[PDB]
DNA sequence: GTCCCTGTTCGGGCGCCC
DNA sequence: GGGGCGCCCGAACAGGGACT
């Protein structure tokens, strides 16, 4: 085999991202995996004269005593030059075809940008640095360069099983069928066998979370005040929402716990608004040259709400994620893995997340709960407590 | 002597060229030491005499340790390529395990034993007032540390492979070597390590070969069952300057790793207005008092222990007021592995539950660096205070495994906003407006019982008037109050339950909230003619 | 757009190690 | 003169809300 040249986008350096502290577990696993990869020629030791760096860690998959190395290539990916039926299937299995990539060499003059560093416990030693000689798992370029080789492999299986949808996303193969679960699994095993000789999701059970208005036999000034603020916000998403009649009940300067009987108008306006919320959002077109943005709100009691959009108030999807000794960060981490999965399946792209958590909290613990082979972009926000009421 | 290791290839930054800089005048005490050093180096191949075919030059000088030769490559360092530093942190004694046998070796003339890339030697040209260049790593170049540290690691890698159960802590040219052998057999391994280094050109002078406890290492003294910091001494000036307090801040911080209780808030608050290092500063009573407290805890004798991987790590946190926190980490009670402080103020407004959650995060990260695992925590906060906070709070927040410790001052939430509006509590509709032009404002309220107040403010901001109005409603209400606001800004601050703030005004608001039996704060959208948010809007906007 | 207020980064100084 | 980590501080952004 001979390599494919690869460039960065013009006016861009390679990544220079500092390695973060790893646990003893993860370091032991990384050192194991790396020495073997260095035997098999997939990575080489390098020096400090290579100025590039990219974080590494490792995840303990399932219960299995098998670790998976995971390189955070988000930066490098940002800097690397540049299947509708799948969401319908009864079952989707996700396969990890990452190691296939190690069979293709990698443009020599590019290898230096794939540098990473293994830390030691208590800084017994300086870091050990490696760079890749082959297509690295997690890199944007790896499925690209390997596509033609991936197609050649799959093409016969696709022929023999035309009802089956196979989608690839970096290290991942999504395999969808309408088979009952036993024959599905048997087919997956069949596709695995086919893959060997070269070298559980349920999409149409994905519900959306509608905005919904409370029902009450008596309304206080407070109740109505909450209602009108909520409607007034929602009207930014559903311009047919109307608040005029209801608001007119709050003329005067009244006690919060004073009871207000609703007029005929106000009941009608409330009835309309109830219906308008049913009617699906209009005029939202997925734009693949724009970021997918995800917001998550903590609702409490293991309840999480999310929306995916690209323009403010123009939601592509809105959802809920539900689950004593609950672990918020775990839950959040699991929520963003779930949302990312949906987002890949529906649009083949990974959303930028707005996380309702302090940076240090998140960065302290999220690798403890991560099970995906990809990592989405994210940023940290201070949720104005208004919006957590809006998706109540 | 000179390592036969491969040189590390190194470049200038694109489109740049070597330094051309005049050697500044130098005392003869130094010139004598220079040529003494240079005649030997030149004899040994480490520096070569150059001619006039070398355009470049860089100033050199010396300081006493014997003498250390230095080169002010600040200009070369600017033109050189970037390096990824391989030194990720500083080994700490509390992460060492008990070893049967221990050695500490220093490597002799370390840098000068590692060859410098040939194609790069020319740029290192320097002139004694005689012209030379470097054939080995120079002290002052920014590439020398990483190239040394990396070369050292290549050199130790075979020995480490062959001897996986000998532990070598490698800090620049410093080696701590620990084994579970008897001293006889340990010493045989040491010798094997020294001949290994000598094969690669690195000598280990017996002069710096420590064979008996207490070992001197990284600023500590290592005894077989305990460790201590090397003596710390604080200045005793009467007049203090910026640069003096910094020396005191820094030294206290360093002490805080093993001396429990250290605090540096007030001392630090001093260094705020300053624009230059020379300024002297009045040691405020708050600060002068702190000094003595610290100064007192230093007099007592103190030591950490080593790490037993087969027991648990325990971190125990204590609160010290003014956003100051101290901790101790141990496996067995009153036998500290180490200690620390946390004192960072994050946010304009915060409470003690957040700060405690930040101390936990810090300690967790630090523990992962040193021991590679998370400790179990012991915290001055009720399991039920925590759950209240975790419930109501809108952010994901979490604390790893922990038990309560009733060692006051206990961490507590100082007030709680009601979830439902209060019956028999007067309803205040507050609001503020400000003029961006004149900076003039108004804050006021209107209440369901007919009360109405408007206060005019000067030199204010919109957000401020909005907080002023809330404060005003708190001031003129009974022990139970409903307040309706249209400010996300104000609602956002108060709903997160701060007990401390950078803002005097928010502090005053906080004090009111604690006085009250019941507060219910509610939000409405502005300019939507909600009554009587609508009625108080007219009032505070008039003339504004 | 502008001001305001809040957050983050990143470069000062000092400590400590080599 | 160099590299590392730590601590504190203030400068320069980057956001989102409220306003003419
Ligand atoms: N202030 C320092 N600047 C440095 O560049 N170094 C570097 C990093 S470690 C290396 C030590 O060099 P040397 O071995 O000649 O130092 P040394 O005289 O302390 O040790 P030795 O007497 O040669 O065994 O110098 C050390 C310093 F303390
Ligand atoms: Mg030495």
Numbering used by the authors:
A (entry chain B): 5 to 86, 97 to 213, 233 to 356, 360 to 428
B (entry chain A): 1 to 65, 70 to 133, 142 to 556
Describing publication, verbatim:
NRTIs mimic natural deoxynucleosides or deoxynucleotides and target the reverse transcriptase (RT) enzyme. RT incorporates active metabolites of NRTIs into the growing DNA chain which act as chain terminators due to their lack of 3ʹ-OH. Herein, using the same DNA construct, we report the pre-steady-state kinetic analysis with WT RT and M184V to determine the incorporation efficiency of both (+)- and (−)-enantiomers of FTC-TP and 3TC-TP compared to dCTP in addition to crystal structures of WT RT in complex with dsDNA (RT–DNA) bound to either, (−)-FTC-TP, (−)-3TC-TP, (+)-FTC-TP, or dCTP.
Overall, the positions of the cytidine and oxathiolane are similar as in the RT–DNA•(−)-FTC-TP structure. For the RT–DNA•(−)-FTC-TP complex, the closest distance of the oxathiolane ring to M184 was 4.1 Å, compared to 3.4 Å for the valine side chain. Structure alignment through residues 107–112 and 151–215 in the p66 subunit between the WT and M184V structures with (−)-FTC-TP shows that the oxathiolane sulfur is shifted away from residue V184 by 0.3 Å compared to M184. Although the calculated maximum likelihood coordinate error reported in Phenix refinement is 0.33 Å for the WT and M184V (−)-FTC-TP structures, this shift is propagated to cause other atoms of (−)-FTC-TP to move more than 0.33 Å from the WT structure. The combination of a steric shift and altered triphosphate orientation likely results in reduced binding affinity of (−)-FTC-TP (280-fold higher Kd in Table 1) with M184V than with WT RT.
